[PDB]
Design a binder for these strands. Sequence first.
DNA 1: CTAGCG
DNA 2: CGGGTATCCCACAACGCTAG
RNA 3: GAGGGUGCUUGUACACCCAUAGGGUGAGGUUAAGAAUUACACUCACUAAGUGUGAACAACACAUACAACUUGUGGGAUAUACG
Lengths: 365, 346
Amino acid sequence: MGKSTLKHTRKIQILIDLPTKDEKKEVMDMMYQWRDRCFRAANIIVTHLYVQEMIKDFFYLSEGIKYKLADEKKDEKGILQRSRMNTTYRVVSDRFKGEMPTNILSTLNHGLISSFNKNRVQYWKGERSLPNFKKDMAFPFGLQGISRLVYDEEKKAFCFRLYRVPFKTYLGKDFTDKRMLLERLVKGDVKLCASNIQLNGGKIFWLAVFEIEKEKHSLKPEVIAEASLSLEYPIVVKTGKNRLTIGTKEEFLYRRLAIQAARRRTQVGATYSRSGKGKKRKLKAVDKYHKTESNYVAHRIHVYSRKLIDFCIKHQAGTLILMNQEDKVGIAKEEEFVLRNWSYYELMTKIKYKAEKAGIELIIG
Amino acid sequence: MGKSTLKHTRKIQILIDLPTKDEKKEVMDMMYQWRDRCFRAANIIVTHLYVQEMIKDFFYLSESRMNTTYRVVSDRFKGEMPTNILSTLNHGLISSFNKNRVQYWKGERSLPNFKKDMAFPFGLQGISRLVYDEEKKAFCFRLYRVPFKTYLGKDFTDKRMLLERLVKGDVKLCASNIQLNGGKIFWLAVFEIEKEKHSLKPEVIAEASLSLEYPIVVKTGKNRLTIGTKEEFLYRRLAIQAARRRTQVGATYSRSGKGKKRKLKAVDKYHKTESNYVAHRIHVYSRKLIDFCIKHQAGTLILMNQEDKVGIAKEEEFVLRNWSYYELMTKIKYKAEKAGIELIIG
DNA sequence: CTAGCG
DNA sequence: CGGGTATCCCACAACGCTAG
RNA sequence: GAGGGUGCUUGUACACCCAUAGGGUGAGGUUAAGAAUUACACUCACUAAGUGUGAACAACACAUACAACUUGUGGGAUAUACG
C-alpha cells in the first residue's frame, strides 16, 4: 500500500509557561543555546562526513584498495569501528553533551546523513560545496520532546513539556484550523513527525510536521483542465466553456517591481544614514525588507494555487495539464527579467503538492 | 599601521602562443588534467590536515607538517603535474587552515572544500620571460615551459597599464591563479603595489558646482564624482516636517492649561533638529568633497558659481540653493585649510 | 524521561 | 573586483526501536 | 508621512498606539590632530508601540473583516547597493 498521508508543516506559536520573568529568560537563553549548539553540531556532522570519504578516496588512489565505510566488526575492508551514523552521532554527542538534549543530535544526524548520501556523487565529482549551516537554523527535534500534552481549560491553551520546559500553545484566534489538529494528537488521531523549532526575536515557533490524509473528491479524470502561465496573466485556465483568470499583472508583477524600487531607493539612501557604527546599523533600513519580497510573492503564489485548485474542484477537473511549460522554461532561462520576476518553480511545486493532496493528477508538457 | 602595499586582482584573458590549433587543443586539455589533479590534491590536503589536527576526536576509525602531505602529493602526481604548483597549493591550504583553526574547532564553520572549476594556483616561478612583445602586439610569457600570448582586445581599462608596470617591475606579483571558464583561459593575478605617498599638486584643477538633481557635483580631469542625490537629502526633511505637522495637530487636540512650553516644546525640538540635520548633512557632503580632492592629489579646488539668469534656472529650487547656504562655504574652506587645499571662489 | 544504535 | 545579500532555480528531509 | 507594535503565521484594508526609528545611543578596535575632538559601508550590542485591573517597566484578562496557511536545510545562479 502506498503512502496515504502527505507531510505538512504548520506554524504554531508557543510561549514559555513560567510565572516570572527571570525563569522565562532562563528558558529563552537555554533555547538560544540549543540553536547555537545545533548549528555547530550540523557543521561538525557535515565535516565529519566529508572527511572519511576523502580518507577512502586517498587510500583507493594510493594503493587501490576498495575500502568502504562500515563497522570493521562486520566488514574486513571497512574503516569505521561502528556504524557510520553512530560515528557522527557519537562524536557530536561527546563534543556537546550536557548543554542541549541528545535528541536534537539524534534527529539532526539522520537528516544530514540522508542528504549526504544523495549528494555523495556530486561531492566526489566536485560541483557542490560543504554546507555552511547558518546561525538562524531551526533546530530539529523528535517526538521524544513532546510529553503530557493536554488541554488545560483554566488557560484555554494546549500545555506540554518540551524537554523539561513547559509550554502553553498560543493559537490565538485559530479555534478551527490548528486547534483541531492538536486535539487530534492528544487523543491519537493524527501523527506528528519530527518537527523543527524556530526562534525569531523573542517569539518561539513550533514548526510541527504532521501527516494530512488526502481528500477524496468527486473527480472525473476524463475532464481535463488546461492552464497557461505568463508574466502578463499569471494563470489562465480552461475547462470546456469555463475560464478563470487568476491574478493580474498589476497585482503581482507591478507590485513586486514597486517593492524592488523601494528596496533600491533605500539602498541608495543608506549611504548617508547613521555612519560610524558598523555595517549592520547603516543597513537597518534595508534589513526592514529582510523577507518582504519573498513573503509577498509567496502569498500571491499560494492564493493563485488555491484558486486554481478550487477551479478544478468546482468543475471536477480531475486532471490538470500545464500547457507548453517546457517552452516557457526554455525561453525564460535566456531572458533575465522573466527568470528573476516570474516565480515558476514555487508555483510549480505548490501546484504539484496541492494537486497531489487533492487527487488531481498533474501533467507538464 | 596597516600594510604599506595594497593588493589588486585583475581578470585577464590569456591564450596559447602556438601556431597550430592542434597544439592549442593539446595544451588546453593538458591544463584541464592539471586542474583535475589540483582539485583532488587540494581536497586531500585539507581533509588530511583536518584529520591530523583533530585526531583525538577521530576515535571511530579502524586501528615540518608540510613535508608529509607534500611528498604524498608528489608521488601522487609526479610528471603529470608541475610540482611548483602543488607546493604553492599545499602552502595555501596549510596557511588557510592555520588562519581558520579557531573557527574549525568550535563548529562555527565546516571544512571548506573546493570544486571542479577552481582556478589552480601558481607562484612567480611558473611565469618565465614576462616580456611585452611588439611584433605580437601583446604581452608574452612562458608558463611552465609553455609559451603564452595575452589578449586585451579593445580594453581601455587599467589592465594594460598594470601589465606595463609589472613587466617594468614597478609592481610586485603575488600568488596568482589561472581559471578555465567557458572554453576560455583566464589569469587571476594578485599584484602587490606600494602605496605611493600622495602629495597635493597645485596644477590639478577641481571644479565644484551645484546642480538641480545632485547636492554637490565635482569635476577633476576624467575623474567624476557626485555627492548625494536629491531624494537622499529630502527624505529626512519630509519626515521631520510630517512629524512636526502631526505633532502640531495632536497638540492642538491635546490637553491644554498645563503651559504653552509643554505644548510647543515638541515643535521647537523638531525645528532645532531639522537645523541640526542640515548642519550634519553639509558636514558629510563637505567631507566627501575634501576626500574627492585628496584621492586625486588635487591641490587646487575651485567652486563654480554657475548661476546664469532665467534659462532653466529661476524656476527650479536648485537643491542646496546656492553657495550661500548654512555655512557650507566656510566649512569647505576650513576643512581645506586643515588639508592645505587651494580654494578660489568661482 | 533520555540516551544509544543502525 | 570584497563580503553580504535581495531574489531565482533545484534537490532533499521531516526515524524507528531498545534499554537504563 | 512612509515604515512599524499589539490583533496565531503570511497578504489586503482596518480601530488603538510608536515614529527625526534611513534615529537615539552604548561597548570594543583602528586612525588623524598640540588639544577639544573627528572618522571608519570597522565589529558587536541596546532603546517606541492597544484597553482594563494591577503602586508597578511583574502578571492576568479582552482585543478586526476578508483571502491564504508545507515548511525548514543546503547547493547552484543572477542582480542592486556600496569599496
